[PDB]
Design an enzyme around this catalytic site. Sequence first.
Site, short mmCIF file in Angstrom:
data_model
loop_
_atom_site.label_atom_id
_atom_site.label_comp_id
_atom_site.label_asym_id
_atom_site.label_seq_id
_atom_site.Cartn_x
_atom_site.Cartn_y
_atom_site.Cartn_z
N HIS A 1 0.82 -1.23 0.00
CA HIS A 1 0.00 0.00 0.00
C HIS A 1 0.86 1.28 0.00
O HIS A 1 0.74 2.12 0.90
CB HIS A 1 -1.00 -0.02 1.17
CG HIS A 1 -2.04 -1.11 1.10
ND1 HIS A 1 -1.97 -2.22 1.92
CD2 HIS A 1 -3.14 -1.19 0.33
CE1 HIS A 1 -3.03 -2.95 1.61
NE2 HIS A 1 -3.77 -2.37 0.66
N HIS B 1 1.26 1.59 -5.81
CA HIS B 1 -0.10 1.09 -5.76
C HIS B 1 -1.09 2.19 -6.16
O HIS B 1 -1.97 1.93 -6.99
CB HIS B 1 -0.43 0.55 -4.35
CG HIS B 1 -1.85 0.15 -4.18
ND1 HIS B 1 -2.39 -0.92 -4.88
CD2 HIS B 1 -2.82 0.71 -3.42
CE1 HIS B 1 -3.66 -0.98 -4.52
NE2 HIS B 1 -3.97 -0.03 -3.63
N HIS C 1 -6.57 7.33 -2.26
CA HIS C 1 -7.30 6.23 -1.63
C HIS C 1 -6.63 5.38 -0.52
O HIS C 1 -7.36 4.78 0.27
CB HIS C 1 -8.05 5.37 -2.65
CG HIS C 1 -7.31 4.13 -3.04
ND1 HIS C 1 -6.31 4.16 -3.99
CD2 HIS C 1 -7.47 2.86 -2.60
CE1 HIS C 1 -5.86 2.91 -4.06
NE2 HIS C 1 -6.54 2.10 -3.26
N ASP C 2 -5.29 5.29 -0.49
CA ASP C 2 -4.59 4.53 0.56
C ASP C 2 -3.60 5.44 1.34
O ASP C 2 -2.59 4.95 1.88
CB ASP C 2 -3.89 3.27 -0.01
CG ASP C 2 -4.75 2.01 -0.05
OD1 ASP C 2 -5.62 1.86 0.83
OD2 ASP C 2 -4.53 1.16 -0.93
N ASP D 1 -8.72 -0.81 -7.67
CA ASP D 1 -7.96 -1.22 -6.48
C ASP D 1 -7.43 -2.65 -6.58
O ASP D 1 -6.40 -2.97 -5.97
CB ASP D 1 -8.82 -1.05 -5.23
CG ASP D 1 -8.08 -1.00 -3.90
OD1 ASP D 1 -6.87 -0.62 -3.90
OD2 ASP D 1 -8.72 -1.24 -2.85
N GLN E 1 -5.08 -17.65 -3.75
CA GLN E 1 -5.24 -16.79 -4.91
C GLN E 1 -6.39 -17.27 -5.79
O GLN E 1 -7.19 -16.45 -6.26
CB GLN E 1 -3.93 -16.72 -5.72
CG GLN E 1 -2.88 -15.77 -5.12
CD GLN E 1 -3.44 -14.38 -4.91
OE1 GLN E 1 -3.75 -13.65 -5.86
NE2 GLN E 1 -3.64 -14.03 -3.65
C1 LIG Z 1 -8.25 -9.24 2.25
O1 LIG Z 1 -8.45 -10.51 1.61
C2 LIG Z 1 -7.70 -10.76 0.48
C3 LIG Z 1 -7.13 -12.06 0.33
C4 LIG Z 1 -6.30 -12.42 -0.78
C5 LIG Z 1 -5.67 -13.82 -0.85
C6 LIG Z 1 -6.08 -11.45 -1.79
N1 LIG Z 1 -5.32 -11.81 -2.84
C7 LIG Z 1 -5.12 -10.83 -3.76
N2 LIG Z 1 -4.38 -10.93 -4.89
N3 LIG Z 1 -4.41 -9.84 -5.64
C8 LIG Z 1 -5.21 -8.97 -4.97
C9 LIG Z 1 -5.42 -7.58 -5.46
C10 LIG Z 1 -5.68 -9.54 -3.77
C11 LIG Z 1 -6.50 -9.15 -2.68
C12 LIG Z 1 -7.03 -7.73 -2.50
N4 LIG Z 1 -6.32 -7.05 -1.36
C13 LIG Z 1 -7.00 -5.86 -0.84
C14 LIG Z 1 -6.38 -5.44 0.49
O2 LIG Z 1 -4.97 -5.27 0.36
C15 LIG Z 1 -4.30 -6.45 -0.16
C16 LIG Z 1 -4.87 -6.90 -1.50
C17 LIG Z 1 -6.69 -10.13 -1.65
C18 LIG Z 1 -7.49 -9.83 -0.53
MG LIG Z 2 -7.22 0.77 1.02
ZN LIG Z 3 -5.85 0.19 -2.38
#
Ligand SMILES: COc1cc(C)c2nc3[nH]nc(C)c3c(CN3CCOCC3)c2c1
Ligand SMILES: [Mg+2]
Ligand SMILES: [Zn+2]
EC number: 3.1.4.17
Length: 315
Positions: free
Chosen positions: A70, A74, A108-109, A219, A271
């Site tokens: 973050h 990003h 946003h972050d 996002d 994933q």
């Molecule tokens: C919170 O739960 C999850 C769990 C997994 C396994 C995730 N795997 C991901 N892969 N790519 C993306 C994009 C992504 C996200 C989204 N996230 C939002 C919050 O910050 C981290 C990224 C995930 C969010």
């Molecule tokens: Mg955020």
């Molecule tokens: Zn974000």
Amino acid sequence: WQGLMQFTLPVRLCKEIELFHFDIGPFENMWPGIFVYMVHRSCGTSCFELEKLCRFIMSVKKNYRRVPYHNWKHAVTVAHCMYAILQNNHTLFTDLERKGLLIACLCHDLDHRGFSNSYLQKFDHPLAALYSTSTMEQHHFSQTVSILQLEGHNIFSTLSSSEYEQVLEIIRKAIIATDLALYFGNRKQLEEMYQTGSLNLNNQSHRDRVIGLMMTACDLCSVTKLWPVTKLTANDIYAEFWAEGDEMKKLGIQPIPMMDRDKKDEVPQGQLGFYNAVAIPCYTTLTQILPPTEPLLKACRDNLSQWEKVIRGEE
Ligand SMILES: COc1cc(C)c2nc3[nH]nc(C)c3c(CN3CCOCC3)c2c1
Ligand SMILES: [Mg+2]
Ligand SMILES: [Zn+2]
């Protein structure tokens, strides 16, 4: 901010910055200049006073932590995908929306500490006592206005009070919608509106929800890049997740599999579940409302097939 003023985008990038799959990664020093160009192309060449615009951008960059995920990269990645959404769907959104949405994506972050809302809410961090729901997202918008209120930073100073309050409400709603906890309910209501044929973009409530899903699509966009890019981003998402899970076990609580570094083997499966339950439905309903956003869906499907290949042991 002075050096940012003379910047001009190379002609080779102008053509590729318009594409969905575009990766900002190899151009680190061009990122602030990439945001300026995107604002000029979507909104206007003299939309904001260049001096204030460049003061704001650089101040936003400075307010992003040295966290693995973050961070500043990003924010520029999220802003770029929004530009491509806005460029391919230009006449469905107002000047005030396009400016607010690009600004919100860059902000946003803001001041993210590499920690989830779940952590703060249980360990009673002042932010959780300050905001109960969408903890970090309320702090990001709080930091956005605190950068605007700085000397020579209010880029929206040219606007009328009615437009200034509208744009700030567009930005508040946009930053709040990045709380993934809100996505699930938002997308379900939109799926209902689409199937029945009741969705109307002239209905302000419907408009906010579509803007909401656009915010989530942006996002999460790192899942719409080429396989070697996506793979290297997954390293950043987990390095942050694990560092949080490390603090959790120090306090006496057991972290969730995604937040426990002793569970790195479950990553391809984790994933796959995320793509099937979050990522793919997001882009499916986005392509339905906005058909020119279809390449985001294709690239995500390509990346799911790649995770399906790692799972089958054919890496
Ligand atoms: C919170 O739960 C999850 C769990 C997994 C396994 C995730 N795997 C991901 N892969 N790519 C993306 C994009 C992504 C996200 C989204 N996230 C939002 C919050 O910050 C981290 C990224 C995930 C969010
Ligand atoms: Mg955020
Ligand atoms: Zn974000």
